[PDB]
Design a protein around this ligand. Structure first.
Ligand SMILES: Nc1nc2c(c(=O)[nH]1)N[C@H]1C(S)=C(S)[C@@H](COP(=O)(O)OP(=O)(O)OC[C@H]3O[C@@H](n4cnc5c(=O)[nH]c(N)nc54)[C@H](O)[C@@H]3O)O[C@H]1N2
Ligand SMILES: Nc1nc2c(c(=O)[nH]1)N[C@H]1C(S)=C(S)[C@@H](COP(=O)(O)OP(=O)(O)OC[C@H]3O[C@@H](n4cnc5c(=O)[nH]c(N)nc54)[C@H](O)[C@@H]3O)O[C@H]1N2
Ligand code: SF4
Ligand code: SF4
Ligand code: SF4
Ligand code: SF4
Ligand code: SF4
Ligand SMILES: [Mo]
Ligand SMILES: [O]
Ligand SMILES: [O]
Lengths: 234, 807
């Protein structure tokens, strides 16, 4: 089994809804986004081309992040996913630098520190991050998703790395990744690339797919089909 | 012990824009954790725009009010800290009730005003009934700072004072004058769902001074100079007639078959037999005959071959042709005739009420008003409601011809001027909700001045926003999306839906629902103080549709208000219009009621116009202008001059070119502002959400965690600007500071900047120093207070000239 994703760039509207869904699903610290994007503007006015590519972990066939990890914390699972045993991460940061795609982040700060602030913009009138934390009963942020804790720390510790886990905790329950359900045009599809009858396997046979940095030789398993823009008329 | 999937999904409605999408909220451990589109929705299904997730940083915003407050600084002003202190609900409403009753005792109830920003369909009580019973005509909505000019074409051509849905799934040609439907407009979820697929069967042209997301995903981006849209629309219509490619089944044809429309030459009206339209040949003879592609190219720089090719492509696609207008094209001082000129194409190519075209929202049985209040008006109220409105609608220079009536439409931004000048009179007591006009209206410092002159104002709000700074009393609202009972609608995908808003969490703080609990509590307080008409109206007229009983308490009344208006959907069999629902509980559980599909050509031959036709020569507008002229004892031409339109004679009633109004010396202010919305703006309400900043560059050309104004590199070089420079942008009426971004997707001679930042209040993320220093720059401080006087709309586009400098 080799799970992967096909993203249809013609359907994609470049809205970031997938990345915002990932924030709500996975409790990433402010500024840490497992799902993100690469946008480019090319050309001189009036012949200007703007394109948007959503990005995530490519759960590579030959993953440098796994190979460089000195403790074995970063590893492949039986689905082909690159997952991390966060408890065994010693914060050496080698995975982050070895990853050709730059999709790994480092918890330099204790996540969600901004929620420990008890200052009020209008004293005894508006609330505060700490007061809202206490009122809702959450541990670190009122937006924390406890489901994340099924297979990974709900809140990661300082001095560990982290990245897209392909919503493994949702896959374990037969559910879809958050970014997949969040996409208004159903541009994102996942499945087993080793199964010739999966929708992803057929999509990449019906369309000539593009991959990110194929020259790096990692065998990424996110495939892009079609194009964000269309041929200019007139 | 695993927890994935063990929570519950509860139905509500999002209001980040007037798409008003039906949602489900995922709740676990009493907290809202996720938002998704409601799969039971017939308009959009689970599809959603990205802002649904930002909702979670609004309900859990750490700068929300948790208590009523009163100011303790008697001075008001941008420079005056209100020094708010907490008070109880009872004291806050006691204070407001005392001020209201004093107006009635003094026979001046018209000096009360109710201001409405956002709202739900239960608003009739707080907005209209409470206001009139007190005795005031001044229930002032925000419609004219929204999009009333965009309704002028649809109303005066085909009788629809309202919006349309666009049948993108079946379109063969899409022409957008400024609309960016995969980012803004009124079904971002559904048009994002379908846009990419539609490119495989439709040719799509987007006309916008900036390269929008939609233009980046279009077959042609036309970077129009601001305010020149009608030139292109008129030339397209001209070519359609020369080429003989109007849609004959809708428009008609020449009696003898031969096409007699030759450029520049008049034609006998009697040689043509119109079917469902009126005035085609008069339009040609009076103007359209000379709106050639060469004429249009000289003004716009567009290649005349491109204009001709577009017209021919639209001809071949007819009737599967749809023309969109955005605020940007029509919310300009002469913009009524851009709405008319662009919308005329929807008739010329037969797209109106056709497959692949556009048409109004489907009929539903939702009730929109509570019972009549005539029996509860006393003599004081009966006299007050006849006074002139504070926004001066209906004066010679403010016809505001909503639905054909002189003085029929609100003029939101001008209410600040009436208040500021006490003309027609002083406003002494103001209640306002879900609004921030100092920030959202052009030249909002006028609202600073006006509010500082109002003796007593109370603001119903979640956050202390810029408008709140001027309040005597703050009444904290329960959040509309998570803590409220309400009801909304949405249109698209060939249907109209009605969706519920219901509480999905235990109420966080000591707040109340703006449109139900607060008017109920205020009515009770007024009755305690000797004025019980609102209370009697509520408990005798707003009673349960099943039990006939009034509400027992606040919480019950909040739900009752929704039950009352929606009963035709779930108490009766609504099968004739759409879904059959068995009970109130089924409505709440599913969260949405769906109509049947729209019946194509339904309005053909029965438009609610003067002629019952689709009017290229709008006798409907002539009748409305004649009424206004007769009222003020002048000619229609004198009305046009008094309202600063160029049209005279027959041109007042047909699609024609108005040179765009411009304000300021072009040599001093060489750039035209291109105001735009952020695709992460939930109207003016997501600037205090940190995720907004983290992903702000999903707006093409913009920069995460910053507020940028975008310049074409040509102009950046000319003014010595580099990416990241701190800059000051100045217009004749104001200034802002932000950062510079150079971007080729900006038409040279313009500067494209998102509205939405520049808050100096709201919260700790939205402002640099709360109450003192803004984060980013406030666009509306640049935008001179100007009006499309025929509609009452405020102008946000086309007339704004600015200059830029570093530091
Ligand atoms: N993301 C987001 N979506 C929204 C809202 C929101 O706040 N955020 N608000 C909702 C509401 S209340 C409204 S009323 C609707 C409004 O939706 P629309 O009427 O479709 O327009 P706007 O979203 O206001 O954007 C105006 C666009 O006009 C452009 N434009 C500016 N000047 C000109 C000009 O002179 N000519 C032409 N052709 N274009 C010009 C700007 O570049 C911009 O793309 O959107 C709703 N949808
Ligand atoms: N330059 C520029 N100006 C614009 C636009 C633009 O594109 N460019 N868009 C215009 C358009 S289309 C519109 S419709 C208007 C809208 O303008 P407004 O009607 O004034 O709406 P907002 O700016 O969103 O102000 C809403 C205020 O309600 C409060 N509030 C927030 N959340 C809640 C809640 O849940 N319940 C209650 N009771 N109160 C709440 C806050 O005080 C908030 O500031 O802005 C307009 N102004
Ligand atoms: S949610 Fe879908 S449409 Fe939006 S950026 Fe992500 S992949 Fe593209
Ligand atoms: S994309 Fe980077 S983090 Fe993900 S598996 Fe490949 S090398 Fe590792
Ligand atoms: S930072 Fe952690 S996961 Fe990454 S290589 Fe080092 S120990 Fe392994
Ligand atoms: S698969 Fe899950 S973890 Fe990966 S980008 Fe999507 S939401 Fe985030
Ligand atoms: S912000 Fe507007 S389009 Fe987006 S989910 Fe909410 S109502 Fe729908
Ligand atoms: Mo609006
Ligand atoms: O609206
Ligand atoms: O609105």
């Amino acid at each position: 089994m080799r799970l992967g994703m096909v993203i249809d760039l013609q359907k994609c509207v470049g809205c970031g809804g997938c990345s915002l869904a990932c924030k709500t699903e996975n409790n990433t610290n402010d500024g840490i986004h497992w799902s993100h994007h690469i946008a480019t503007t090319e050309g001189t006015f009036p012949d200007v081309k703007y394109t948007y590519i959503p990005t995530l972990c490519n759960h590579c066939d030959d993953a440098p992040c796994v190979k460089v990890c000195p403790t074995g914390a970063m590893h492949k699972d039986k689905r082909g996913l690159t997952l991390q045993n966060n408890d065994e991460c010693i914060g050496c940061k080698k995975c982050m630098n070895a990853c050709p795609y730059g999709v790994i982040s480092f918890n330099a700060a204790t996540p969600h520190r901004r929620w420990q602030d008890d200052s009020e913009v209008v004293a005894n009138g508006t609330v505060s991050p700490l007061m809202l934390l206490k009122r809702t009963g959450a541990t670190a942020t009122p937006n924390e998703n406890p489901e994340r804790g099924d297979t990974y720390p709900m809140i990661r510790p300082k001095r560990t790395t982290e990245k897209c886990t392909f919503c493994d905790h949702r896959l374990d329950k037969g559910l879809n990744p958050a970014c997949v359900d969040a996409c208004p045009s159903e541009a994102r599809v996942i499945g087993d690339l080793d199964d010739p009858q999966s929708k992803v396997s057929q999509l990449i046979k019906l369309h000539k797919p593009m991959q990110l940095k194929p020259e790096a030789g990692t065998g990424p398993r996110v495939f892009y089909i079609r194009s964000f823009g269309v041929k200019t008329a007139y | 012990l695993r927890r994935t999937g063990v929570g519950e999904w509860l139905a509500t409605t999002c209001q980040g824009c007037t798409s008003w999408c039906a949602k489900q909220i995922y709740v676990m451990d009493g907290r809202a954790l996720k938002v998704r589109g409601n799969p039971n929705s017939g308009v959009h299904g689970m599809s959603s725009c990205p802002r649904q997730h930002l909702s979670l940083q609004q309900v859990y915003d750490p700068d929300r009010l948790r208590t009523p407050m009163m100011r303790t600084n008697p001075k008001k002003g941008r420079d005056q800290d209100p020094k708010f202190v907490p008070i109880s609900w009872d004291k806050a409403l006691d204070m407001l009730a005392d001020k209201i009753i004093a107006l009635r005792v003094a026979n001046e109830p018209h000096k009360y005003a109710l201001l409405r920003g956002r709202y739900s369909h239960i608003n009739d009580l707080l907005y209209k009934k409470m206001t009139n019973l007190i005795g005031s005509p001044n229930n002032i909505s925000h419609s004219s700072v929204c999009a009333e000019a965009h309704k002028m074409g649809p109303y005066y051509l085909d009788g629809n004072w309202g919006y349309n849905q666009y049948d993108v799934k079946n379109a063969k040609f899409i022409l957008s004058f400024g609309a960016d439907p995969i980012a803004s407009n009124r079904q971002v979820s559904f048009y994002s769902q379908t846009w990419g697929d539609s490119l495989d069967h439709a040719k799509v042209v987007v006309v916008d001074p900036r390269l929008s997301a939609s233009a980046a995903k279009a077959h042609k981006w036309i970077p129009i100079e601001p305010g020149q849209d009608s030139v292109l629309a008129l030339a397209i219509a001209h070519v359609a007639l020369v080429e003989g490619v109007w849609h004959k089944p809708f428009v008609g044809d020449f009696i003898e078959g031969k096409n007699l429309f030759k450029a520049g030459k008049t034609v006998s009206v009697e040689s043509f037999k119109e079917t469902h339209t009126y005035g085609l040949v008069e339009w040609w003879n009076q103007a359209l005959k000379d709106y050639t592609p060469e004429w249009a190219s000289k003004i716009t720089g567009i290649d005349p071959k491109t204009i001709i090719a577009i017209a021919k492509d639209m001809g071949a696609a007819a009737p599967a042709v749809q023309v969109w207008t955005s605020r940007g094209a029509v919310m300009q001082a002469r913009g009524t005739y851009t709405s008319i000129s662009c919308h005329a194409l929807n008739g010329l190519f037969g797209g109106i009420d056709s497959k692949g075209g556009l048409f109004p929202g489907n009929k539903t049985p939702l009730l929109k008003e509570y019972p009549e209040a005539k029996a509860y008006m006393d003599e004081i109220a009966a006299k007050g409601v006849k006074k002139e409105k504070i926004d001066q609608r209906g004066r010679l220079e403010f016809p505001a011809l909503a639905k054909g009536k002189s003085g029929g439409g609100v003029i939101t931004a001008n209410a600040a001027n009436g208040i500021r000048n006490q003309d027609p009179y002083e406003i002494k007591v103001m209640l306002a909700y879900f609004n921030n006009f100092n920030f959202s209206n052009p030249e909002g410092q006028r609202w600073d001045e006006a509010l500082s002159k109002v003796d007593f104002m109370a603001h119903i709000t979640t956050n202390v926003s810029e408008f709140s700074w001027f309040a005597d009393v703050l009444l904290p609202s329960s959040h509309h999306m998570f803590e409220k009972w309400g009801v909304l609608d949405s249109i698209g995908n060939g249907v109209a839906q009605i969706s519920i808003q219901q509480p999905s969490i235990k109420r966080l703080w000591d707040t109340r629902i703006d449109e139900s609990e607060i008017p109920y509590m205020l009515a009770k307080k007024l009755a305690d103080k000797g004025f019980d008409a609102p209370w009697r109206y509520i408990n005798e007229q707003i009673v349960d549709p099943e039990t006939g009983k009034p509400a027992a308490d606040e919480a019950e009344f909040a739900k009752l208000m929704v039950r009352y208006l929606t009963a035709p959907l779930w108490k009766e069999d609504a099968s004739k219009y759409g879904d059959k629902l068995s009970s109130w509980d089924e409505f709440v559980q599913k969260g949405v009621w769906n109509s049947s599909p729209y019946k194509l050509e339904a309005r053909w031959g029965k438009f609610k116009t003067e002629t019952t036709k689709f009017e290229f020569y709008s006798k409907t507008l002539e009748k409305a202008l004649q009424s206004h002229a007769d009222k003020h004892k002048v000619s229609i031409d004198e009305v046009m001059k008094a309202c600063d339109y160029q049209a005279r004679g027959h041109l007042a009633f047909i699609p024609h070119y108005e040179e765009p109004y411009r304000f300021g010396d072009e040599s001093e202010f060489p750039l035209l502002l291109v105001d735009q919305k952020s695709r992460l703006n939930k109207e003016g309400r997501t600037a205090n959400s940190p995720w907004y900043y983290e992903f702000k560059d999903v707006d093409p050309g913009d920069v995460a965690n910053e507020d940028v104004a975008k310049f074409n590199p040509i102009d950046g070089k000319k003014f010595g600007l580099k990416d990241g420079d701190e800059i000051r942008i100045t217009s004749p009426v104001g200034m802002l500071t932000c950062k510079a971004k150079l971007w080729e997707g900006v038409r040279p001679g313009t500067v494209a900047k998102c509205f939405g930042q520049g808050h100096w209040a709201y919260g700790r993320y939205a402002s640099a120093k709360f109450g003192v220093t803004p984060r980013g720059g406030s666009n509306n401080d640049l935008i001179a207070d100007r009006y499309d006087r025929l509609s009452g709309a405020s102008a946000f586009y086309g007339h704004i000239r600015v200059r830029v400098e570093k530091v």
